[PDB]
Design a binder for this molecule. Structure first.
Ligand code: MG
Ligand code: MG
Ligand code: MG
Ligand code: MG
Ligand code: MG
Ligand code: MG
Ligand code: MG
Ligand code: MG
Ligand code: MG
Ligand code: MG
Ligand code: MG
Ligand code: MG
Ligand code: MG
Ligand code: MG
Ligand code: ZN
Lengths: 66, 185, 130, 66, 141, 37
RNA sequence: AAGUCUGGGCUAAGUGGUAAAGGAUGUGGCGCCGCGAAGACAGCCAGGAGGUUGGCUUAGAAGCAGCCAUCCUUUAAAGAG
């Protein structure tokens, strides 16, 4: 998730099972549907709810325009 | 390339005895003679280790004589990997059968590809006058891809120096190279 | 014994291709400054010969067996000795005597000094181009 | 050597150079290059200068024609 | 793993590890060998462990020569059964090996690499072993 | 402490020591510590 | 019962006075290479600099995520680390 530009909010147990909560730019979240299942061997899930927009870093915002 | 090595006569002494005392029993011979000799083990080792069965060793006898020999066989102690006894063939001016090294030249195509140069022969049997031993014999191996060989039939030959074994006798080969991507089967 | 013998030679060859080679404390400075007195003396002199650094022990046997008196100034210390006659031996010894007397305190002092063929002297050497 | 992209054509590396070529440059197009951004460099020559990109081209995926 | 393709006899008497090695006491193919310092029946599974270890360390490269071969059938009575009522069943094959035998040899690889491989394969073996290199003494036999 | 029959240098900074009769390995790295046993 | 006998050596574990793979700067003795007053090994005083961010990759990997390349340069010496 850090590979996807993510600020990590924390972790917690659930069904044991550990949860992970973090802000990932939806931009870097296409493949994560089956990219999760690839790394948990068919034992993963996620939810994803928009929290906020924010200015993309100038390395991109001054480059996506091309 | 002209190695010499001090060698002393022996008669009744027990081999066990000579061996306890640093010495290495052995015998020198040829069609004309036969003497039981011994040599200091570490002196002989320093020598033979580079002389092998390849280059003339020259025996400095105590009576003063100075015989050029080839080492003809070296008996090993099977349990300890020590040399137990040496045979010294006393070279005459006739031609004599012998082993001469094969230096394998260059770097084959089968290496640089994965493979390995199996050197089926690291020297060769040869009729030759003592007055011209080639401390070498080059073989171009560079043309080999993995799968290929090279026999005595190839292999140049200095004059001269004839073979002394069927040229149907393979001397190198490039075989494939172990590899873990095999394995699981 | 050793390949410090291919160090005597190529440092006695390009030593016995002159007559007035001087000496200085040539390690003291950064790799910026140690390309500064190096760009300049590769211009303010001749060829690419500022300090052709090699061992104090080697130069002293070298400037001993190739005769040249023996620059008994002091080969001691981080000393690489600026081949002054492997450059156009001139009043360009100021290119040195100025370089370090400004850039970092004592940043290129001298020591031994052989002028023409006879030894100059200590401070008779930095006053020998100023 | 940023300049080297407009003398052979390419804009990218070769990922596996050595056997793969995707362009070429000769003994003289290296000398012109050994001149432009050269008040900088390090040395001052032309043959102590050309062998400075003649292998900075093979570090990506372009060879030297001789 | 290793075992005879066919035999004349299914089972054979145990015999006896007296003696130095009869044969195979010099290196004869590669540049480095592993030689046995103690007598044993070495099993196929052992030899095979020994091999695999070497290849996994070479990891593409080199030739491993395997100079012993397990052709002596090993018998075992079924667990929890009494004495008698016939010789037991063949459960595997072993190589009789006596001191001074070169068991494996390697070639086409560095000294700092055969050394290790051979160091390792020793570990899989149930005896003490020295690592050797070719010598003239070898060449001379 | 790792207590083992086989103690060895693990990394280039590892150090083998014998103390009060007993072979140890000490190291910059706390995981590398070993007493033989 | 009869030597706290004589001479040379080793052991520091009460080893002697019950055990294996294997591990080990234990200790004593051999042997063989390598460096060494053209000044080594250890410590410490400098230097460790360029082309250059090595291309791609990718949001960015600038000597160090990873596919690969790995030449030369002023040099006493400074790996595209
Ligand atoms: Mg020996
Ligand atoms: Mg029986
Ligand atoms: Mg039998
Ligand atoms: Mg068994
Ligand atoms: Mg049975
Ligand atoms: Mg074992
Ligand atoms: Mg041997
Ligand atoms: Mg035979
Ligand atoms: Mg372990
Ligand atoms: Mg420490
Ligand atoms: Mg007493
Ligand atoms: Mg006790
Ligand atoms: Mg006890
Ligand atoms: Mg010991
Ligand atoms: Zn460590």
């Amino acid at each position: 998730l850090n590979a996807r530009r993510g600020q990590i909010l924390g972790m917690e147990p659930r069904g044991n099972a550990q949860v992970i909560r973090a802000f990932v730019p939806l931009a870097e979240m296409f493949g994560y549907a089956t990219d999760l299942r690839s790394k948990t061997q068919g034992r993963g899930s996620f939810v994803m709810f928009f929290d906020h927009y924010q200015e993309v870093p100038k390395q991109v915002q001054e480059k996506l325009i091309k | 390339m002209e190695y010499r090595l001090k060698a002393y006569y022996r008669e009744g002494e027990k081999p066990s005895a000579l061996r306890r005392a640093g010495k290495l029993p052995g015998v020198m011979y040829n069609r004309h003679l036969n003497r039981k000799v011994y040599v200091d083990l570490v002196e002989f080792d320093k020598v033979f280790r580079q002389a092998s069965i390849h280059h003339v060793i020259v025996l400095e006898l105590p009576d003063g004589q100075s015989l050029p020999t080839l080492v003809r066989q070296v008996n090993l102690d099977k349990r300890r990997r020590r040399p137990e006894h040496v045979d010294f063939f006393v070279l005459s001016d006739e031609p004599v059968e012998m082993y001469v090294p094969l230096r394998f030249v260059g770097t084959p195509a089968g290496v640089r590809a994965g493979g390995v140069l199996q050197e089926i022969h690291r020297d060769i049997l040869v009729k030759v006058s003592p007055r011209n031993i080639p401390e070498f014999i080059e073989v171009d191996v560079s043309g080999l891809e993995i799968g290929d060989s090279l026999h005595a039939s190839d292999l140049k030959l200095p004059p001269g120096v004839e073979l002394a074994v069927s040229p149907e006798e393979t001397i190198a080969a490039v075989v494939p190279p172990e590899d873990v991507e095999k394995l699981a089967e | 014994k050793r390949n410090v013998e291919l160090l005597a030679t190529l440092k006695e060859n390009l030593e016995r291709a002159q007559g007035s080679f001087f000496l200085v404390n040539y390690q003291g400075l950064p790799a910026k400054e140690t390309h500064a007195l190096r760009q300049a003396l590769k211009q303010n002199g001749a060829r690419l010969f500022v300090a052709k650094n090699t061992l104090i022990r080697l130069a002293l046997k070298e400037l001993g067996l190739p005769e040249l008196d023996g620059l008994q100034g002091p080969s001691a210390v981080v000393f690489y000795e600026d081949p002054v006659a492997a450059a156009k031996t001139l009043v360009q010894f100021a290119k040195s005597n100025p370089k370090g007397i400004p850039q970092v305190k004592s940043g290129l002092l001298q020591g031994q000094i052989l002028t023409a063929k006879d030894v100059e002297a200590l401070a008779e050497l930095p006053t020998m181009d100023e | 050597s940023y300049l080297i992209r407009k003398a052979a054509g390419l804009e990218k590396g070769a990922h596996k150079p050595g056997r793969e070529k995707v362009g070429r440059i000769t003994w003289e197009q290296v000398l012109e290059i050994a001149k432009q951004k050269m008040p900088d460099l390090n040395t001052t020559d032309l043959e102590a200068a050309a062998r400075m990109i003649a292998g900075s081209a093979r570090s990506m995926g372009v060879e030297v024609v001789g | 793993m290793l075992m005879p393709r066919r035999m004349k006899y299914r089972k054979q008497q145990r015999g006896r590890l007296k003696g130095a090695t009869k044969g195979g006491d010099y290196v004869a193919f590669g540049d480095y060998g592993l030689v046995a310092l103690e007598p044993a029946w070495i099993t196929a599974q052992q030899i095979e462990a020994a091999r695999v270890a070497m290849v996994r360390h070479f990891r593409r490269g080199g030739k491993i020569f395997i100079r012993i071969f397990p052709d002596k059938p090993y018998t075992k009575k079924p667990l929890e059964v009494r004495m008698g009522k016939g010789k037991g069943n063949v459960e595997g094959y072993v190589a009789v090996v006596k001191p001074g035998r070169v068991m494996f040899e390697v070639a086409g690889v560095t000294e700092e690499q055969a050394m290790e491989a051979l160091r390792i394969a020793g570990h899989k073996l149930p005896i003490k072993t020295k690592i050797v290199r070719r010598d003239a003494y070898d060449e001379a036999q | 402490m790792k207590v083992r029959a086989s103690v060895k240098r693990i990394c280039d900074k590892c150090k083998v020591i014998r103390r009060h009769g007993r072979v140890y390995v000490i190291c910059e790295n706390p995981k590398h510590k070993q007493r033989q046993g």
